[PDB]
Write a protein that binds this DNA or RNA. Sequence first.
RNA 1: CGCGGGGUGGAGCAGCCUGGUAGCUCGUCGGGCUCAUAACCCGAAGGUCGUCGGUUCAAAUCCGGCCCCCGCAACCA
RNA 2: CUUUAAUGUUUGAUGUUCUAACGUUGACCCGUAAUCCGGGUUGCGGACAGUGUCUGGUGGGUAGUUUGACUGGGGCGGUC
RNA 3: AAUUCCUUGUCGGGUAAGUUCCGACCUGCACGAAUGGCGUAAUGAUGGCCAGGCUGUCUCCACCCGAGACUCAGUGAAAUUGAACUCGCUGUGAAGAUGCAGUGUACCCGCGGCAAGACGGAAAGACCCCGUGAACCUUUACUAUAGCUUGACACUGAACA
RNA 4: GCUCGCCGGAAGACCAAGGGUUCCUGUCCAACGUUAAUCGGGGCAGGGUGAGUCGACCCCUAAGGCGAGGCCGAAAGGCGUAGUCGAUGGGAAACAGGUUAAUAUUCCUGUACUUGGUGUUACUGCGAAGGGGGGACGGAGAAGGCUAUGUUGGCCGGGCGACGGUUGUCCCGGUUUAAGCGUGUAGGCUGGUUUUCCAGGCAAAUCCGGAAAAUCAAGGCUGAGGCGUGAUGACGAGGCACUACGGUGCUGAAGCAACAAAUGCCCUGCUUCCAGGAAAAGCCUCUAAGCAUCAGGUAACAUCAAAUCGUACCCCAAACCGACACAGGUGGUCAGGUAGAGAAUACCAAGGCGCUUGAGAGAACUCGGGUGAAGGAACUAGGCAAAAUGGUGCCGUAACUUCGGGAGAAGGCACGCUGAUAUGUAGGUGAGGUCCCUCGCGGAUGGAGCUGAAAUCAGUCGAAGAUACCAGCUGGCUGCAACUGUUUAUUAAAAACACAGCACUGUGCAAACACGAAAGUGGACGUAUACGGUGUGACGCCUGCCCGGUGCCGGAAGGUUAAU
RNA 5: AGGACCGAACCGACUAAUGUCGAAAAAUUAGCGGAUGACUUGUGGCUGGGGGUGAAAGGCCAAUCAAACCGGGAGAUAGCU
RNA 6: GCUUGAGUCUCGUAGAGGGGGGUAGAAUUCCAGGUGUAGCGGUGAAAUGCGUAGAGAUCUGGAGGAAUACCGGUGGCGAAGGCGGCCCCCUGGACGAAGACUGACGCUCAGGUGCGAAAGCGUGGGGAGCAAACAGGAUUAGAUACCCUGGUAGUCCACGCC
Lengths: 46, 271
Amino acid sequence: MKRTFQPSVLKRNRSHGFRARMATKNGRQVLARRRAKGRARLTVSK
Amino acid sequence: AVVKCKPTSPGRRHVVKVVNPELHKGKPFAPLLEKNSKSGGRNNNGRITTRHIGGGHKQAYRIVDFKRNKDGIPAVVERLEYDPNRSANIALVLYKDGERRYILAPKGLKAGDQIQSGVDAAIKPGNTLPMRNIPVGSTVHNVEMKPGKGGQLARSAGTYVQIVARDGAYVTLRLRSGEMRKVEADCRATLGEVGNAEHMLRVLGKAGAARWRGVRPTVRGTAMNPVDHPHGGGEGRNFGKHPVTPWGVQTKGKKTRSNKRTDKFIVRRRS
RNA sequence: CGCGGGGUGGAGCAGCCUGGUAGCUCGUCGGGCUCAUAACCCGAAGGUCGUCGGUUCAAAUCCGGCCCCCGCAACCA
RNA sequence: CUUUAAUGUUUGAUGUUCUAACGUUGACCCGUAAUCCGGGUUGCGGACAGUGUCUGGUGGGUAGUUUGACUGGGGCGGUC
RNA sequence: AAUUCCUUGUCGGGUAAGUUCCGACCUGCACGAAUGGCGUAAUGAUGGCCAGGCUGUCUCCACCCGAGACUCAGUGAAAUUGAACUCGCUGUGAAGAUGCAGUGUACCCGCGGCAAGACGGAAAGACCCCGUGAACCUUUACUAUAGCUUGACACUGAACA
RNA sequence: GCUCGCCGGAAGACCAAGGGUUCCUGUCCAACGUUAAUCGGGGCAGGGUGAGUCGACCCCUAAGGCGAGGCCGAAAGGCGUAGUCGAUGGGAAACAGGUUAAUAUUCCUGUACUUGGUGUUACUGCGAAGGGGGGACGGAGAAGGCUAUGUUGGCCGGGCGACGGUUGUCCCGGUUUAAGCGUGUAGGCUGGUUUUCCAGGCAAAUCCGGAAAAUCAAGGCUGAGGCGUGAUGACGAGGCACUACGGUGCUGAAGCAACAAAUGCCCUGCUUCCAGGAAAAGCCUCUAAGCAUCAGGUAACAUCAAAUCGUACCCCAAACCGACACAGGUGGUCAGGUAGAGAAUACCAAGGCGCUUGAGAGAACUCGGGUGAAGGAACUAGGCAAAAUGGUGCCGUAACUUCGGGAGAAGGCACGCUGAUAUGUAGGUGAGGUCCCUCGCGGAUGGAGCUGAAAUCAGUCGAAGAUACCAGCUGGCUGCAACUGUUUAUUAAAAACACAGCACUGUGCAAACACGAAAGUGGACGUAUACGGUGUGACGCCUGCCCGGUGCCGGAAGGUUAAU
RNA sequence: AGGACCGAACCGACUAAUGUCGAAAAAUUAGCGGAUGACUUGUGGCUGGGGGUGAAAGGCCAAUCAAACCGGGAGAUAGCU
RNA sequence: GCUUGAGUCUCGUAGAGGGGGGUAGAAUUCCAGGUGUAGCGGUGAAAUGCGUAGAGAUCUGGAGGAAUACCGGUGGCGAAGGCGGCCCCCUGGACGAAGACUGACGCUCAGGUGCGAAAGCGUGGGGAGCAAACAGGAUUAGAUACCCUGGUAGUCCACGCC
């Protein structure tokens, strides 16, 4: 069974990256809430 | 030509391939070829705008000159090439001043003959000139719609448009559907119909013969579900409806000619 | 069990709905036409209105019971 | 009052012609090495087309809902 | 007959025996000609029927070989559970009783077994019905609506006939 | 440590992906491991990743994304031009041995190579966002010639062997060698060169292209392997020497021939068919704008520079993904001995393991298997499951048919080993010798050696000779669907769907239609022999009657009829 | 040449059995079907919730689908338990 | 070997002989516009159909398809079937004239092969008129016949089949 999560570093950052979020207004709405909870891990990055 | 393949296998016993032993088996001209990526129904928005299109084989785009603007230059035909993007074959042509260009090949066009454009050319299938210097009743093709565009009508295999009459700056044409259309007389045409007339006789045979071609399987509405198609429904092939398209507009009898800006050019509708 | 429809000259069918008077075709009897039959033309008779009661001035007719016949329903587990 | 004849006038329904509005997913040149676009000559149509507003018709493509109850279980029939 | 309710209709063939199968008869409840009809070689992890070959599937199981089951040592769960000094029968009863009544019987307590019961355990029944519940879908249910289409007004003007 | 057993086209050795110190070492055993544990991927401490040639970054580009202006849209935002990113693509350059507790085409030893800066010298015209060439390509099939690699032989070293033989047709072990450079083969491709002119390539061109001529018959280009060299070098069986008894130092013979042979290489070839098979840049080359005693270009030589980042270990699994040290899934390369068609399979080499609960009993019963008298589907919903058939060559093969098939139909015969034909044949390869030559990696000629089917006859062992693994059940009737193909991932794989074909109808291109408030795209850089919709669904014989109800289309006169 | 045949790797999942608090939240075992094509597969993108996709089952869209998940309307409403 | 067999060569004649490619007018149907009015069409009689939305009729223009009045004749050609408006190109056969030439090359012919009207069939176009099937209206005892109003396949063409 090919479990529903075949890992890929490159694809992760092309769809969940930091700068990937800074693209649209909706993305900046994400980090708004992320910093709202004072979460140390803003987004999956390196 | 027409050659029935021997019934050696299920899927081959109905294949009739067109044999045209005049096509150059060599490699097509490099400078006259550029790429044309596939999209298969997808568009700007990425939706499947048009169904049953995709997959298929890879094919490089050919530059066919419809304008043929060069005047007073004889053209020695080089060879007949095969064309994926068009049902009509293309003839590699060499001008007198040494330029290689492609043209849609008429009926009697062999490897090496001559053609010429402008209003100095007489009547030989392949000659190009405005229809205000043409004999009334000539069989032509690659006729254009606007003075200088290049060509829009009569381009497929075995297609020919018969010039009915000529009144001033308007030529009474007869398109292939038989729909009389008055086009501006300042439009360039090409004598002689397109050959390759055995194209109709070609019968694929295999479903794969359509798959590598570029088509995609069409599913009937009588099998689908009401949520996906207006026909569907029922446990046992029920119909009871007026056959309509996947988008509600009625078919099998529904005229959709609403142009208004070109109504003046249609003498009689196609019949 | 329940719903709807029908039963009218010898046969096949109108008429009923909006109650008093019954029609068409065929068929039968009789005549003519022909050597003769059929066909055709002409003339006429023939209907307990399935069955009984009730209501009404009056019942094929309106209603109900009964009999026969036709179609539908005779179900979901 | 009816039938009517000419003129002045008043809007309206068509026909054809015309070019400035406008359309131009025609050609050419330039911005510009750029099949986008904008503009300038020219060509082709033409007061249409297309669009805004109001309105008749169509419309299960789509949306929101309705689709009675009693009933020797409900349904059917029947009934209120 | 993928269709025939009645019906396993009737005749003939295959079996000693045939509600199936095969070929015909037409009384087709309710086949039928692109919501295609009748045939059709080949193909088919397709359906039904039959024969040969070969076998434990069967008459009826018998034995042997390995891993568990079993014993010892180490580690060590789970479903479930009001409380139990937790017997059979006859009757009674929210109507099929281990517990009430009557009577009979039975030393206390383990392990391996087997599953008739404890209407055993698991899923606040999927069946039926209800709620002036929801959700999708249908159309000649009601009212609206995108789209399409019609005419007028405006962008939109000059002329004569 | 000694035996046994297991995988071995993997349960092996390494990379990409993806984890992130799990790698190595010492120490410790509470917690972690379904058991103990001085063991360990557990805790604690220390060490380890060394690059101009590997990869990435970088030069360039596709699908596609963002997108100066701009078009459009309540706003957000959407789209798109020039550009700019984005590889799974293309583009410069290193191989061998040794060395560590762990890393090495990275360090060391030896031997080569690439791209630029700068300087000097001898010469010469150079020169873009522009042109041309090149880059640059499909599938399948067949074939020649080699290599990886392996066996045998020769030679070299050792032994002659605890039970009968073994100094000989005996046994075991080794017999390894690259990048580059030079010559430039098998084989493949293309006719070279010189002169003139030109509406052609946005401009221009000496580059390309076309069109006329002359001379001669070759030249040029591409190209595995071999042969030399690289190397009187390294490695090297086995000894010689010290043992912390793990290993280290030193020394060291042979190192060739032949045959067989890849899916690797030539091949990014050739033939053939069709469904007709990226782009750009590096490179090469030509000019414009211009600069010219220059700057620069070409060639040689010297020197300098080649940065940044990853580099440990696992990588078909106890380290990724499945909550677990989980019988699952994971792309790619190399891939030997024997039989065998084969990467199947059985047994083995290299290499890596015995799967982290065992000791007894051998009960019923349960799971995986073997065998079974007589009979043979009598079982049952049903021949479900097992059983049996199963290879190659040859003999031979029906109804029907679209004349391809059906078909490997069905049904049978011979298969071991040895000898003889023949001190192992046909066939294949091919040294030496001989001759010639436009002289080399040449061609005829010649045939040793080596390798090696199969057929025929005879003899002989056994019940059985495709003796194991492996390896079709077949025939007859017939429904349905043509067929290969597709689907309910996780109860339905079929007659359901798709299918080429046929039919109707829509559409004259700013086409219909679809997405989208719009712009703009798809359709299609296609255009009626085209495209969209629907229905049926190979082929063959055919496809009747109805225009009432409903829908569509045509004609609009009249009645009715909103806005104004 | 072939949507050709037999048959590994490979892809899929028809039959039977084991398993069902399993070794595993669909696998193993012994047989199967395709296996040069309508093929399989890696890397990298595009299409998105009344929308996407679909050789069309109302199957698939992170083990969940006749309408995904998450937050907020919302302590929605419940004549019912 | 010689010719009275047959065949060939030199010159002309008539001809719907065949194939391919163009061309013309009359006539019919269809469409649009102008003039114009209640019938038109049809038969043995009648009716369906067509028409007051204005047909038919008449005139003008245009697009189509097939067949070719008169000449035309028991005339001509060809093996037969069959073939006729005109023209061009390619081309077969028969006949007559006066001679020459080869020297029996002749005749027929199971099997075999080829041609072959119409109807019919397939693939692809064309579609005016005519008209199976079918439909309506009459006639009729019945009329799925004869009559009339329409009308698909076919009839035409290129390539094959029978």
